[PDB]
Amino acid sequence: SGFRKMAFPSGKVEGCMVQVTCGTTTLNGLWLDDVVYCPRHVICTSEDMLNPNYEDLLIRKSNHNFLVQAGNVQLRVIGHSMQNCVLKLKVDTANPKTPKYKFVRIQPGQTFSVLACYNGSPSGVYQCAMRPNFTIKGSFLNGSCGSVGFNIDYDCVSFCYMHHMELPTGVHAGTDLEGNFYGPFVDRQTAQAAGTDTTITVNVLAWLYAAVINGDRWFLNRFTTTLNDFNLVAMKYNYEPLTQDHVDILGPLSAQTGIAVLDMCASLKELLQNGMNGRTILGSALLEDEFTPFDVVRQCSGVT
Amino acid sequence: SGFRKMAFPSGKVEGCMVQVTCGTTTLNGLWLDDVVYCPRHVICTSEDMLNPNYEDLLIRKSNHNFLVQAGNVQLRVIGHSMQNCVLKLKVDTANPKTPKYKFVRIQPGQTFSVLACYNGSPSGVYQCAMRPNFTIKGSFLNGSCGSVGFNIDYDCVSFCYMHHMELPTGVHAGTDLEGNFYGPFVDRQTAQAAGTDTTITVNVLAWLYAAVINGDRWFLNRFTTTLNDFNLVAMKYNYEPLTQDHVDILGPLSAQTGIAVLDMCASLKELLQNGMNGRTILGSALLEDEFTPFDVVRQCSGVT
Ligand SMILES: CC[C@@](O)(C(=O)Nc1cnccc1C)c1cccc(Cl)c1
Numbered sequence: 001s002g003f004r005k006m007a008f009p010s011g012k013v014e015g016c017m018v019q020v021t022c023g024t025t026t027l028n029g030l031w032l033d034d035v036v037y038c039p040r041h042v043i044c045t046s047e048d049m050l051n052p053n054y055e056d057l058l059i060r061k062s063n064h065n066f067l068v069q070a071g072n073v074q075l076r077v078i079g080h081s082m083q084n085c086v087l088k089l090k091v092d093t094a095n096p097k098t099p100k101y102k103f104v105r106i107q108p109g110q111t112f113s114v115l116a117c118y119n120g121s122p123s124g125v126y127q128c129a130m131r132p133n134f135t136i137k138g139s140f141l142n143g144s145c146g147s148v149g150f151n152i153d154y155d156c157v158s159f160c161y162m163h164h165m166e167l168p169t170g171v172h173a174g175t176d177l178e179g180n181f182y183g184p185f186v187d188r189q190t191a192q193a194a195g196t197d198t199t200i201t202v203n204v205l206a207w208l209y210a211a212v213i214n215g216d217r218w219f220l221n222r223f224t225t226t227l228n229d230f231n232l233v234a235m236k237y238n239y240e241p242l243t244q245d246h247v248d249i250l251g252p253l254s255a256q257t258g259i260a261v262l263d264m265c266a267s268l269k270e271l272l273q274n275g276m277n278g279r280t281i282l283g284s285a286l287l288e289d290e291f292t293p294f295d296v297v298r299q300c301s302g303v304t
Numbered sequence: 305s306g307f308r309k310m311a312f313p314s315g316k317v318e319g320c321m322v323q324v325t326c327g328t329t330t331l332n333g334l335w336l337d338d339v340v341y342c343p344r345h346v347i348c349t350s351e352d353m354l355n356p357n358y359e360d361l362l363i364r365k366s367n368h369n370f371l372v373q374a375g376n377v378q379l380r381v382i383g384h385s386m387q388n389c390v391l392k393l394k395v396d397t398a399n400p401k402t403p404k405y406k407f408v409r410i411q412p413g414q415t416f417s418v419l420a421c422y423n424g425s426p427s428g429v430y431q432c433a434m435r436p437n438f439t440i441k442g443s444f445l446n447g448s449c450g451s452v453g454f455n456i457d458y459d460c461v462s463f464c465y466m467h468h469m470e471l472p473t474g475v476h477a478g479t480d481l482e483g484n485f486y487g488p489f490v491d492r493q494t495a496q497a498a499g500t501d502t503t504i505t506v507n508v509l510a511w512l513y514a515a516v517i518n519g520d521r522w523f524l525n526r527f528t529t530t531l532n533d534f535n536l537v538a539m540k541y542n543y544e545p546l547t548q549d550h551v552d553i554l555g556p557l558s559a560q561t562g563i564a565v566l567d568m569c570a571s572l573k574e575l576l577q578n579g580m581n582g583r584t585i586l587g588s589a590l591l592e593d594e595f596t597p598f599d600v601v602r603q604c605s606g607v608t
């Protein structure tokens with residue numbers, strides 16, 4: 001029993017972190033096989049960041065300008081290329097600690113673990129959700145760029161995020177491992193709007209099921225609702241509209257607890273309309289949306 | 305910017321986890337050098353747990369009865385001994401992945417990362433605080449016994465906790481790595497009282513400083529208080545009394561923010577007396593107490 005915001009064990013990712021330096025800029029890189037992946041803004045000075053022409057900037061760089069260090073050993077750079085907003089530095093040595101891996105582009109509302117790094121060294125690990133507006137609410141300081149997000153399925157690491165920037169609002173933006181930004185963001189020091197964020201409804205329902213499984217049941221009521229009635233309330237409270245696809249993914253939790261998804265929606269409706277009245281759910285005084293239905297099943301069943 | 309409940313990178317600990325089986329009971333063990341540490345209740349059947357005589361139970365066991373498996377390779381057991389509530393199984397091979405380590409007994413209110421494991425395999429990592437009543441609010445299911453808590457200082461892992469049991473209340477109890485329980489708990493399936501828990505006042509103040517550093521300032525007020533006036537409020541709200549030792553540890557955060565510790569105490573006093581009025585602090589609708597002043601400095605400065 002108990003329910004925590006749990007991150008994946010970070011060992012397989014720690015073995016891939018390297019430090020990348022170009023000129024006077026240092027950030028993190030990800031060494032998988034004989035390639036090091038890092039944000040392309042490693043080639044910029046602070047002055048370049050205001051309006052960088054990455055193609056022109058990269059042309060003044062040669063393989064020997066990219067200094068890649070793994071722990072205390074230097075990697076020899078034999079190739080360099082830009083793919084979208086990431087640089088791929090071909091090295092002469094395959095990372096001996098390369099885990100089985102995939103590059104995946106996650107959907108908004110999905111969760112992942114972040115291994116925050118500075119100078120190629122891991123500082124901590126935490127669990128994040130990609131917001132519906134494609135930002136992440138992380139914990140990152142200058143130098144954390146190149147830190148990655150990932151999920152693990154048995155022995156396979158699916159890398160889904162690489163950190164690139166902090167918006168003036170204090171929220172974070174980054175790319176998939178092909179260098180494609182999540183959201184409308186560009187890798188330039190200019191004010192950029194993150195659209196309206198919404199609460200991930202399917203995750204809140206999943207977390208309500210986790211609460212029932214662990215004994216926190218005070219919010220269960222004698223009511224039910226319909227998908228259309230519930231979505232009228234979701235719209236009013238800036239919650240994502242719930243679809244039959246979301247109900248279908250909640251199926252296993254509905255089966256295990258015997259609480260129909262629409263009955264849980266009616267509990268969520270009353271919580272939105274009346275608040276928590278000074279009470280808590282799983283040690284939280286607000287509705288938590290950074291646990292997917294998959295996360296709830298995994299944590300509640302001890303998947304390793 | 306941003307502030308997250310961050311755990312230490314778990315790689316160094318993942319390399320130490322093993323599976324220990326004795327009879328029909330399987331749990332986790334910690335392999336450091338040529339010794340495997342695990343909860344002594346690995347020698348019990350469910351029937352023994354009601355009132356075990358560990359000395360008598362261990363006498364019916366020989367080295368060959370303890371099956372220790374690291375990944376897929378079997379370790380040869382050449383010695384066994386009981387120290388308090390842990391078993392130490394001497395093996396013929398030193399763990400090649402043994403990190404630099406220490407065994408430490410933490411104080412209540414201190415924090416640590418837990419690597420939850422099942423069958424010797426890591427499932428997740430999360431950050432915990434040892435409650436003032438010496439319980440932890442973890443996420444553990446049957447089979448998680450032997451999972452450990454730890455802190456890391458550069459390359460040194462200080463192991464501080466080994467999981468042993470879940471109390472009937474759903475909270476968790478365990479030992480230091482010498483097998484000494486934190487709190488009054490015994491390793492027996494009998495109802496056991498965890499005393500009154502209190503909120504870790506110095507940690508809440510540290511988290512309030514983290515909030516100010518990250519821009520959440522609405523709770524700062526025009527008031528101040530004294531240690532004695534503040535402690536009258538702390539007693540009324542089941543908060544730990546604040547001492548000059550606690551004020552001294554908050555010194556660096558007071559210096560960085562320019563907010564005197566007693567002025568932050570007056571902000572905390574008003575929050576306790578008036579609540580949050582439907583507002584949040586660092587994405588929380590309650591006062592968070594599982595970040596120490598050390599954690600706040602480390603996270604806010606990017607220590608790796
Ligand atoms: C220092 C600026 C920047 O490197 C950044 O946001 N870094 C940064 C990242 N995370 C947290 C804090 C900081 C400071 C920057 C700014 C705009 C665009 C891009 Cl691609 C990069």
Ligand SMILES: CC[C@@](O)(C(=O)Nc1cnccc1C)c1cccc(Cl)c1
Nearest residue numbers: 001345444445446468469470491492493
């Ligand atoms: C199954 C009982 C027990 O192994 C336990 O609490 N395990 C357990 C641990 N964490 C979470 C869930 C479970 C179930 C037990 C009970 C009393 C005393 C002791 Cl030393 C051990």
